Design a protein around this ligand. Structure first.
Ligand SMILES: COC(=O)[C@H](Cc1cnc[nH]1)NC(=O)CN(CCc1ccccc1)CC(=O)O
Ligand SMILES: [Zn+2]
Length: 957
């Protein structure tokens, strides 16, 4: 019978009957809540742990101490003391790992190839028993956290997030600064005689208690096997018995209500943030009052709040509902963006907001609205897509802290109790008497008197004038507002059509005309009543010039905007659509339950081909678009660097500058005329994949075609017109540099690309294995050791069927410097491939192998792979076996010669391009950096491209 180490074993853990995985929860004797997941099919295994502490519990005098502790647990324990044993064990077993710190949680998670769960899990458990917090590790890692912060500093969503905490009761833990930085984590602690290693030990020791812990483990093993496992490694975690922190006081007290903030953004954006404090509804999770209201306020359908603000040309988008706080407090929000006009009618927008809330009081709670939500959640739950295991374990570790073992799977889905009282109760808190208002606009530039300490946000604070409050308190009904009616998009037909006699393991080309290639597969794997239908429409007029490119965009935005009201129902019924312009024309994906898919598709194509612009909206979207083109100048440095490289290496690319200038030439008449033009000749390549038949698929594709013919007069396009763009071919021994300044951010950015050959079976596996071998050593040398940045990335590049190696770093140090530390790195690397065992080398193959052979867990992931094969026009649907088969063949020498031919500093075929993005402010013991040739500075994009060969395109299959 009984077991000393276990306190209890829960009953049946309720699951979806479609979910084949097996489950067992339990609580150890030390009080760790643990959920076990058995999946005999799984390629990777995963575990995650979540501690119920986070930054809300930092010592007041060392801000960011948990985010810091989180970074430090990866860096050596007593039992596995080598600084990077954890990240290197994973790299070599096809695993990865991350962690995050929120106000009340620290969540640690990883996956690994299924054969090394134990390996991975043992090294993992150590974090929670005896981390070393190595003194020189602490010294180094403090930079990476400073860097986490630098990137967030000029980011308008982080600033807002912290500024909110800075305008509530500063006495409250909510007002803490949870990232931390160099200043707060070493400089100041040094100044104040604080011994940080000790403070870290103390905190670990105080809060990392077993009672406050939840663990999830998903492996190939039996439930009995997993039980013994988790018991073995986790029972020695000590029970220091800490009470869980509570925060029953809202941090927004009287003095903090009826306030208005005027805030300057970094980007040119206008939004209005309306927020009421409310209690913590978490306990009401079985009826879920704030969800019911969120559904209603946030609704986008006919009759809705957004409908009206949108008609009045005041706001373009709206979000509303409950927003988490911590144990003891929540918020209820309603935030909109703001048109130019909208910015001058903020008071009116808030009235409308209250008129709408009034309409809800007048109408009472609605059992049918609650039923609808409920029915959707039961359908959603039953046919949920099966999840990637790392994400799943991370997620359930969190909610193990909120729900009885048995409801952990279903808690966030199944609604059970109708509560008109709670609905009323929450409604009665959404009142002008206790509202806070924030306006974010460039107009407040110059006229603010305040500054946020951490990010440096300029703002102004005021009381809402008392007659403004009254004016809102007296919100009449407004007849422009209605509740939503019954949702017609709700699926009722869930039948999984039987697998057909001619069904195929990969998509089959089942139609091949001048108008359209239709690739097709009935689903042989997941069996949920869902499908993905993907179309590429080709027109050469979508990207012919900058103006045409602008026009394609606008047109597709306006169509989406026109369709929103109608599409929205569909979206809540789990039928969604994506639609955007490409450098080849347009892309249209429709995913979800297949039951009403045909209807939604039809409406989209019908709308596309019969489109009637409305002057007023065109004017608003044009203006939004201009701004976002401008706002690019405020993306982080490494994004700039990637953007430039794309511009540099493609045959044809229209810069942001060129699009911006060309935008003013875009009048309503020119657009009206462009749309029929663009739809007159097309070609469609489509992937239809899911719970659908061959003849359904031909019918759906014909339907699309037939609609465009009937309404657009569309005609086929010629094969010689189906043109793909080529990548620039760099010369042997070549090295070019292109330099720009990031005017917003104070880091610099860099991308370094070593181009290699076209993609091919052998070229692919060379580059890929090289990647794998250097993957974690790069991170470990360039970040952990040399602490060059938070952002440090290396891996294959691929575009236009060509490929190469890239490095991406965001750093405080100049790029000339970044370059050489990579170049030093690359030698450490040849010279340590020489040194490695044959086994180490085979492990690497094996790891890359599992990684590539990892089976899609859900329809759209499989759809993705296929779609990848189709847009690249390689159609190599079984590439994974083929490429893997070949890879198993390679040897330490194969790799060295490849490296020596294409990569080493004095390689005969080194093709290096470097983008240097300099910081706001610049102007233009470690290994050995090789002396580098003087680069050719790229003066002018066009000229440089005029001066070089273009590669071929790759050949199909
Ligand atoms: C569940 O209720 C609803 O249907 C509507 C959806 C909607 C609103 N407007 C169009 N659609 N509500 C939400 O989406 C609410 N949302 C806001 C929380 C939030 C957290 C951190 C930062 C900013 C915002 C919750 C989320 O992010 O899951
Ligand atoms: Zn972090």
């Amino acid at each position: 019978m009984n077991n000393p180490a276990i306190k209890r074993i829960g009953n049946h853990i309720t699951k979806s009957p479609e979910d084949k995985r097996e489950y067992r929860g339990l609580e150890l004797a030390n009080g760790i809540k643990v959920l076990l997941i058995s999946d005999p099919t799984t390629d990777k295994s995963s575990a995650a742990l979540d501690v119920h502490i986070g930054s809300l519990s930092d010592p007041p005098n060392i801000a960011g101490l948990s985010h810091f502790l989180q970074h430090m647990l990866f860096l050596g324990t007593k039992k596995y003391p080598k600084e990077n044993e954890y990240s290197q064990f994973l790299s070599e077993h096809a695993g990865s790992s991350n962690a995050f710190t929120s106000g009340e949680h620290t969540n640690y998670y990883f996956d690994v190839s299924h054969e090394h769960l134990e390996g991975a899990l043992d090294r993992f458990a150590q974090f929670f028993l005896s981390p070393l917090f190595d003194e020189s590790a602490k010294d180094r890692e403090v930079n990476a956290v400073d860097s986490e912060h630098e990137k967030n500093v000029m980011n308008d969503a982080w600033r807002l997030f912290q500024l909110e905490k800075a305008t509530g009761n500063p006495k409250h833990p909510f007002s803490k600064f949870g990232t931390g930085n160099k200043y707060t984590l070493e400089t100041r602690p040094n100044q104040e005689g604080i011994d940080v290693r000790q403070e870290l030990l103390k905190f670990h020791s105080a809060y990392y208690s077993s009672n406050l812990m939840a663990v999830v483990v998903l492996g190939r093993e039996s439930l009995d096997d997993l039980t013994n496992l988790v018991v073995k490694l986790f029972s020695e975690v000590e029970n220091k018995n800490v009470p869980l922190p509570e925060f029953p006081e809202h941090p927004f007290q009287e003095e903090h209500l009826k306030q208005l903030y005027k805030i300057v953004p970094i980007k040119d954006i206008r939004n209005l943030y309306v927020t009421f404090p409310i209690p913590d509804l978490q306990k009401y999770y079985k009826s879920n009052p704030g969800h019911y209201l969120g559904h209603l306020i946030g609704h986008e359908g006919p009759g809705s709040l957004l409908s009206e603000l949108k008609s009045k040309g005041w706001v373009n988008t709206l979000v509303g509902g409950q927003k988490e706080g911590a144990r003891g407090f929540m918020f209820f929000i309603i935030n909109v963006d703001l048109t130019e006009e909208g910015l001058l009618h903020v008071e009116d927008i808030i009235l409308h907001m209250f008129q709408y809330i009034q309409k809800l009081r007048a109408e009472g709670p609605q059992e049918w609205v609650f039923q609808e939500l409920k029915d959707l959640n039961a359908v959603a739950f039953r046919f949920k897509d099966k999840e990637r295991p790392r994400g799943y374990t991370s997620k359930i570790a969190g909610i193990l802290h909120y729900y009885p073992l048995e409801e952990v799977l279903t808690a966030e889905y199944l609604l059970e109790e109708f509560r008109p009282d709670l609905i009323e109760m929450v409604l009665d808190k959404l009142r002008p008497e206790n509202v806070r208002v924030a306006i974010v606009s460039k107009s407040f530039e110059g006229k603010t008197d305040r500054t946020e300490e951490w990010y440096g946000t300029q703002y102004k604070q005021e009381a809402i004038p008392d007659e403004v409050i009254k004016k809102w308190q007296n919100a009449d009904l407004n007849g422009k507002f209605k509740l939503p009616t019954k949702n017609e998009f709700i699926p009722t037909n869930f039948e999984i059509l039987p697998l057909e006699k001619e069904a195929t393991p990969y998509p089959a080309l089942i139609k091949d005309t001048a108008m359209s290639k239709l690739w097709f597969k009935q689903d042989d794997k997941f069996f949920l009543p869902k499908a993905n239908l993907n179309f590429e429409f080709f027109s050469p007029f979508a990207y012919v010039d900058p103006l045409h490119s602008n026009m394609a965009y606008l047109y597709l935005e306006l169509l989406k905007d026109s369709l929103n009201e109608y599409a929205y129902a569909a979206e809540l019924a789990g039928l969604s659509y994506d639609l955007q312009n490409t450098i080849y024309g347009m892309y249209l994906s429709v995913k979800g339950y297949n039951d009403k898919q045909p209807i939604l598709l039809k409406k989209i194509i019908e709308k596309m081909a019969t489109f009637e612009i409305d002057e007023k909206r065109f004017e608003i979207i044009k203006e939004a678009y201009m701004r976002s083109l401008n706002n690019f100048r405020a993306e982080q440095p490494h994004q700039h660097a990637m953007y430039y490289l794309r511009l540099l290496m493609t045959e044809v690319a229209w810069t942001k500058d060129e699009l911006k200038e060309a935008l003013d030439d875009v009048t309503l008449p020119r657009l009206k005329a462009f749309i029929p033009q663009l739809l007159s000749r097309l070609h469609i390549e489509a992937l239809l994949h899911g719970n659908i038949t061959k003849q359904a698929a031909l019918g759906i594709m014909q339907m699309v075609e037939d609609t465009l013919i009937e309404h657009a007069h569309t005609k086929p396009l010629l094969p010689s017109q189906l043109v793909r763009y080529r990548e620039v071919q760099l010369p042997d021994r070549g090295w070019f540099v292109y330099q720009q300044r990031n005017e917003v951010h104070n880091n610099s950015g860099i991308e370094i690309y070593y181009q290699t050959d076209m993609q091919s079976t052998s070229e692919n596996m060379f580059l890929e294995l090289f990647a794998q071998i250097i993957s974690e050593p790069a991170f470990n040398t360039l970040r952990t050791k040399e602490q060059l940045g938070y952002i440090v990335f290396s891996g294959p590049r691929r575009a236009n069927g060509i490929q190469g190696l890239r490095f991406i770093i965001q750093s405080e140090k100049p790029p000339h410097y970044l370059e050489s530390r990579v170049e030093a790195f690359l030698i450490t690397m040849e010279k340590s491939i020489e040194d490695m065992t044959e086994e180490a080398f085979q492990k690497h193959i094996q790891a890359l192998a599992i990684r590539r052979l990892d089976k899609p867990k859900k329809l759209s992931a499989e759809s993705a792979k296929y779609w990848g094969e189709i847009i690249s026009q390689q159609y190599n649907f079984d590439r994974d076996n083929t490429e893997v088969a070949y890879l198993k063949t390679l040897t330490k020498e194969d790799i060295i010669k490849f490296y020596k031919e294409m990569l080493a500093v004095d390689a005969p075929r080194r093709h290096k391009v470097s983008v240097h993005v300099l910081a706001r402010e610049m102007d233009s013991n470690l290994s050995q950096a090789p002396a580098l040739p003087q680069p050719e500075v790229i003066q002018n994009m066009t000229e440089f491209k005029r001066g070089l060969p273009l590669f071929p395109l790759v050949k199909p299959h």
